[PDB]
Design a protein around this ligand. Structure first.
Ligand SMILES: Nc1ncnc2c1ncn2[C@@H]1O[C@H](COP(=O)(O)OP(=O)(O)O)[C@@H](O)[C@H]1O
Ligand SMILES: Nc1ncnc2c1ncn2[C@@H]1O[C@H](COP(=O)(O)OP(=O)(O)O)[C@@H](O)[C@H]1O
Ligand SMILES: Nc1ncnc2c1ncn2[C@@H]1O[C@H](COP(=O)(O)OP(=O)(O)O)[C@@H](O)[C@H]1O
Ligand SMILES: Nc1ncnc2c1ncn2[C@@H]1O[C@H](COP(=O)(O)OP(=O)(O)O)[C@@H](O)[C@H]1O
Lengths: 407, 436, 418, 424
């Protein structure tokens, strides 16, 4: 029994620990350090929970290894279930059959949700043929349903047998399902009040003729721009005036924004100045990089025009003392115990090498611990794994040969 | 009928001892003990299934034979764990974008394991009149089956009866039936005439042998990619004359919101019911340094996902200009961002003393034994330029040895054929003169 | 009257002359000279016709005008019938419809083949039929009878009720040749020309049909004809070919029902190509099922397309080390006149020995191909002169009118454009 | 009525003597003796049909009449030999790959002559009933796959049987009693709404000249006798690439099957590629094997520049925009530059076809101004001078007219002198 959800780099943390005073705990949900980044992330996260404004952009800055993606994934789980969240890489918007504006526009639209309350009754159960009156049977109770001449001609063409579970809805819906008994639940007469949270794909069902095809894949190219505004904003606007539906804001995350086309940066101007639009959490891992397509030098590889539309939150590298603590937190992931002297060698390696390498040293060493038939890892184990796998800084020294440079 | 020694068949996998140490020469693999243990850890990582999204790296000069070591990694895990290679040149596609290609590969690695008991009912079909009847329809099917081992009777549903009536079915015909409800039908499969003429055509076959009911245990493993592409498309066919010619199969990019969530939920329910068991895959990427930088920035974010399986990378060249940057250079043709977090495995050139050993293993694998002199001279030619030149020169030496009538290879044959086929180094020496 | 088949540049040679001792003849099957490349072509040719190994790559290198392509043409003509041979160009794999990788592995797919041994029952002979089945009072079987005669013997048996529709659709007359098949297909011949009688009274026709790897297309596509006649959409979906195709072909192989026959891939002008294709050739050859390919490169060291680095022989070291290079030497002065003579015999041209001497000097000063272009234009001038033999004055005037690149290089002093 | 005066419209032949000598002034073509004598062997090469796959490159200064000479070759070979002009920029296409256009150029160049004997049945249509539907198996009621349709003609009435697919195809179109409907063995539907001499049964031999490429496109997509294929006939595929085995092996095999019977006859074509120095290097790479092909027709090229940088290389430069490996395969032709005397003559020869009477003094002045800058300018100054002569009422062109016309329009070289003043 192995679920699809598995242990991973960002999968070990669940939720973002916060307090009423917005004071980040020392160790909360597997997160240690970055008190300023966690506090500011809690402020902008509260801004997401309030939903008083739209079209905001937050850019976090810092050195590689400060947990930029870990903060975004931490805020994603703390947003709560049944809420739209869209996190896309900078290369996902590129498409040959689709325009560069279509992917970003749909990225802004798909994050905004709509809550609609509809009350519909559902009568579902078994079927018993009696000669036209069908007796609906369920585990809890059984009732008799009389039928006229309207549904007889419809059931003669359709395939209906005794024992099959049928679901009929007062919406006048008809759904035929398998028996699922020899191979239902509840009551036959029930009044169901259900709140259906709907995404912004209403633009796609109104634009397209059928939503079944385009619901399972990206499908069609860029939709007409006038339909997204006049018709969609008109219907949603009237729904806000009537009070039937309530739009719920959402989060849109983009990682590695340092490399992007200038067209996207020019479109983000109107994207942020648009009436409705989700907040933007941006993560740039490079201080100064030339924007692709032109020759320029700007901070965070972004134009100076869009530079003032982002709220930058700086981060600090983790201290050597906190590395042992977060590694102790990572020890609980695989349920593998380490000796007290092993954290000194592992942290010592993590000082001169990247942190993720030390994250892989424990998991890689636990397998050799299994080969040693021991119940706990040893210093010789991690010292052997360090000889088996070496850091980039160590492998660079052995590249001084340059036998074939391919130059 | 014959394996024909496809590619290199001398690799049976690592085959290391239970103590954990690696032999100098084991299972046709000689040397690379540090790479042997390095690749011996990752196979235990895959068999443990504790982590998802791990990254492996093979760093070595061209000709060290790390791809064959990856084949040993694939043979050690067995046929249970799905393993497929991905070349760096297949990411670029006109219809499907590169991001959707790589995503489809990450969905290709992981797979599901379903244990199903196949019940095969096949034989001569004698259709009795249905007993149930009345607002009439069918609702009950009674079909007899007669074979030389015995006769049985099977009751079927009217839906399967329509599935049989879709094709041409007549009395006294052999039909195959599976628990999947698929039934292979052949009109007039039994051998009979009764019409006084043999021109009925169709298929004339004698009565088959064996029992009617066949109970088997078949465990099928289906990759999640075929499930996403199969469920995303209507996957219908031959039910309409216009639609089958209308659909061009553009293979458009799937959406992550609806499809990944739906497949994830239904697979979670199927594995929670105990019907299916999810198994991780292995991704072996070649020429990773030749991908575009967008495939890198999408690649690290893709592998950082919890649902991403373990991926193996290989660097065939040293420091080179990154694809698409045209300015910034990075070691191993990979940027410093993705070069981090990926484990590094050292692969070193073999000493000249293993040349004759590897050539001997390839010789005994091909099935031809060579003399000690041809092994010494051929080994000297191998260590003089490259191992691939001698390994590829092993076959024509046996060919010329067989043409002349000799049962074994002699130094005159290998040294004679070495002058006919020029190595890349000598061919590069004859060139550069700027002639003709 | 004539077959209307125009002779090309490489159409002059037919087959590849070889010996049991691997000693190349002076002139064998049209090939003259290049004894080293002839013996090497015999080694790789015998290795290909052996079929024991697959996945090996052989590269041939030579200067322009050394006859490197004609050797591969002789290998293709001498490869033998019923052997798949795929010939592609380095620029042909570039397409906007499909990716270069899918086109390359599509060529690798077209190279390999599968032979399946099947047996069916086919009736051969004339047709003598009297049809009473058309009129009927009610509905009935309307079987009738049938009478067929063959040189071996005659057979008389009733008509089929299921095939009477195909008999009414197709044209059936007295003495007409029609072959009924177990597949219930329509195959007939002309009976009016033969009768103004062949086959046996009862005979089974067992034919082994070579099945190309295109079965992947009909398996993936809904219809086999559309994507077989034209490219249509792109290739098959990933992971489908290995699973369904490798599983099915795994059920065909080792069971004795079918065998795998490797093919030959031929790429032209590989010197200019993108590095992605060069990287895909290595792993494509390292695959379990790969054809034995031969590639020809005329140019020397040249920068590879896609990068600014100049690789030796216009190919990176990774692909160069993966295959063996066979270098070809230019034609000797003694072999040049022999090539001119065999081209005179192939093109039915009669020239004087002095024309072979002067034209041989032209072959020493200029490339032989230019001389092959001079003789063709000189034969027509000989037709204008009405003589039955070409003269030195005619071919000299042809050399005066048509100027070689080396001769026309000195005429660029006009500076018409830059 | 009006030929639009393309300026290339007046030609007859190369004007070569029966012994092979090039006449000074023949068929309105004066000059380029080496070019015409060089093409006299080319027209015999194309007329001979024995050799194929040989390319001839034309080189010379701009305006030497190489295009008009190639047109004179196409007109000398006759209307039976197809001539397809093309430029290096035409091969670029979004739907078609770059190599497929050059690949099919050899198919559209080569001509074919097919004699198709067809039977036609015409007359007044009289129908009885349609084909009834049938239940699955069971033998039904028979009376299927037989269509009884009578035809009434002036010679007589004859009843004919037709297949169920034919009547099924005619059911979509409007069918009434007493209408003339043409029936052929090709399953074509020809009807006349609102409305027959000769016998009911007809047979005729239709000789059609079809290029190979037309058989390629028509072979890839059928005429749409079927329903779905007719829907594909209504919705046109933008383009599709044909496989090599279908484009070459199969069609060449069946063509060879038509050759041995003697009914169909194949004719070689002429492929004219102009401005080849702007063609990409990839079309040269494929053009190597395209020139080495046995069935490839003779190709003619034109180079308007002495030396150019090879497209896509950005570094290596080559004469005539062609690589040395490909330049060795083509046969170079050098064209002589025109003298002012033959310019003064060719201006008057051009004035003859134009239908404008020009005095000798104006011809001399046009020869002077043509020698000063370019001949093409004096060619373009012919019409405005005559129009001004018609406006002023003069019967013929005068030196003052060409002086005013030459004064109004600035020369290209003079404009080049006025250009680059570094103003605005
Ligand atoms: N404060 C933290 N607490 C726990 N884990 C962290 C913290 N910061 C980073 N990590 C871990 O470090 C790993 C690598 O982070 P990474 O994505 O490289 O950060 P960045 O994107 O800023 O370079 C992540 O998987 C994350 O789980
Ligand atoms: N440990 C080993 N012992 C013997 N031969 C080996 C070993 N590893 C690799 N090889 C040889 O190397 C070949 C594969 O080389 P490959 O991995 O393609 O080189 P590269 O990685 O430079 O492309 C195989 O044919 C195999 O015989
Ligand atoms: N063995 C041979 N005998 C006769 N002619 C030959 C031979 N080899 C090559 N040729 C001639 O060479 C021409 C093709 O040369 P090619 O192979 O293109 O040279 P390269 O490979 O140097 O470009 C053909 O027209 C053919 O007539
Ligand atoms: N020898 C000639 N005889 C008759 N007309 C000629 C001759 N040479 C050139 N011309 C005329 O000159 C005009 C322009 O020629 P052009 O096509 O520019 O030559 P090129 O193709 O060599 O550049 C043509 O319309 C043609 O009628």
């Amino acid at each position: 029994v192995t679920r699809i959800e598995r242990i991973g780099a960002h999968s070990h943390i669940r939720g973002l620990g916060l307090d009423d005073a917005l004071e980040p705990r020392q160790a909360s949900q597997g997160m240690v350090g970055q008190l300023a980044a966690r506090r500011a992330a809690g402020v902008v996260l509260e801004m997401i929970r309030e939903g008083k404004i739209a079209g905001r952009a937050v850019l976090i800055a810092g050195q590689p290894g400060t947990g930029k993606t870990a903060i975004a994934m931490g805020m994603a789980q703390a947003l709560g279930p049944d809420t739209p969240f869209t996190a896309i890489a900078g290369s996902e918007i590129f498409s040959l059959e689709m325009s560069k504006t279509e992917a970003l526009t749909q990225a802004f639209r798909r994050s905004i949700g709509v809550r609609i309350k509809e009350e519909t009754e559902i009568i579902e159960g078994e079927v018993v043929e009696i000669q036209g009156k069908l007796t609906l049977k369920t585990t809890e109770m059984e009732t008799i349903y009389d039928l006229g001449t309207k549904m007889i001609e419809s059931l003669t063409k359709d395939k209906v047998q005794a024992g099959d579970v049928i679901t009929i809805d007062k919406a006048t819906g008809k759904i035929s399902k398998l028996g699922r008994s020899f191979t239902p639940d509840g009551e036959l007469q029930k009044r169901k009040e259900v709140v259906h949270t709907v995404s912004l794909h209403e633009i796609d069902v109104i634009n397209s003729r059928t939503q079944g095809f385009l619901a399972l894949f990206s499908g069609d190219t860029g939709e007409i721009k006038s339909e997204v505004r006049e018709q969609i904003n008109a219907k949603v606007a009237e729904w806000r005036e009537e009070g039937k539906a309530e739009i719920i804001p959402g989060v849109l995350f983009i990682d590695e924004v340092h490399m992007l086309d200038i067209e996207s940066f020019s479109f983000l101007n109107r994207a942020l100045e648009s009436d409705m639009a989700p907040v933007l959490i941006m993560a740039t891992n490079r201080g100064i990089t030339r924007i692709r397509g032109t020759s320029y030098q700007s901070p965070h590889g972004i134009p100076i025009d869009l530079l003032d539309r982002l709220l930058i939150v700086s981060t600090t590298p983790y201290s050597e003392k906190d590395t042992k603590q977060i590694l102790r937190i990572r020890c609980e992931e695989e349920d593998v115990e380490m000796s007290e002297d092993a954290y000194t060698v592992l942290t010592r390696i993590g000082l001169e090498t990247s942190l993720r390498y030390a994250i892989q040293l424990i998991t890689a060493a636990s397998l050799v611990c299994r080969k040693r038939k021991g119940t706990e890892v040893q210093v010789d184990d991690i010292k052997r794994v360090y000889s088996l796998f070496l850091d980039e800084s160590r492998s660079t020294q052995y590249m001084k040969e340059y036998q074939d440079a391919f130059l | 009928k014959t394996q024909r020694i496809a590619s290199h068949s001398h690799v049976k996998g690592l085959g290391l001892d239970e103590s954990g140490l690696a032999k100098q020469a084991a299972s046709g693999l000689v040397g690379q003990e540090n790479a042997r243990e390095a690749c011996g850890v990752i196979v235990e990582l895959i068999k443990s299934k504790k982590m998802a999204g791990r990254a492996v790296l093979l760093a070595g000069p061209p000709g060290t034979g790390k791809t064959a070591l990856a084949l040993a990694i694939a043979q050690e895990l067995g046929s249970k764990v799905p393993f497929c290679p991905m070349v760096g040149s297949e990411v670029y596609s006109t219809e499907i974008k590169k991001t959707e290609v790589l995503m489809e590969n990450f969905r290709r690695a992981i797979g599901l394991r379903i244990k199903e008991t196949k019940e095969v009912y096949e034989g001569e079909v004698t259709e009795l009149t249905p007993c149930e009847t009345e607002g009439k329809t069918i609702s009950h099917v009674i079909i007899g089956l007669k074979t030389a081992k015995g006769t049985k009777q099977l009751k079927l549903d009217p839906s399967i009866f329509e599935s049989l009536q879709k094709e041409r079915v007549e009395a006294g015909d052999v039909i195959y039936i599976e628990a999947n409800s698929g039934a292979v039908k052949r009109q007039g499969r039994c051998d009979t005439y009764a019409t006084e003429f043999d021109l009925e055509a169709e298929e004339y076959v004698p009565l088959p042998k064996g029992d009617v009911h066949k109970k088997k245990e078949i465990i099928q493993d289906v990759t999640l990619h075929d499930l996403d592409v199969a469920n995303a498309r209507p996957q219908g066919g031959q039910d309409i004359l216009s639609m089958m010619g209308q659909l061009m199969k553009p293979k458009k990019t799937e959406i992550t919101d609806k499809l990944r969530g739906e497949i994830n939920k239904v697979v979670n329910k199927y594995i929670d019911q105990g019907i299916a068991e999810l198994v991780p895959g292995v991704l072996f990427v070649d020429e990773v340094h030749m991908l575009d930088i967008e495939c890198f920035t999408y690649l690290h974010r893709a592998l950082e996902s919890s649902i991403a399986p373990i991926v193996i990378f290989a660097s065939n060249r040293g420091n080179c200009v990154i694809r698409g940057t045209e300015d910034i250079t990075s070691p191993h043709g990979i940027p410093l961002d993705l070069l981090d977090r990926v484990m590094i495995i050292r692969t070193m050139l073999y000493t000249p003393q293993e040349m004759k050993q590897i050539i001997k293993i390839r010789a005994q694998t091909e099935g031809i034994n060579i003399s000690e002199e041809a092994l010494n001279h051929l080994g000297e030619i191998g260590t003089k330029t490259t191992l691939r030149y001698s390994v590829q020169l092993l076959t024509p030496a046996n060919l010329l040895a067989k043409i002349n009538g000799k049962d074994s290879i002699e130094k005159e044959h290998v040294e004679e054929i070495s002058e006919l086929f020029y190595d890349a180094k000598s061919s590069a020496k004859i060139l550069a003169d700027q002639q003709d």
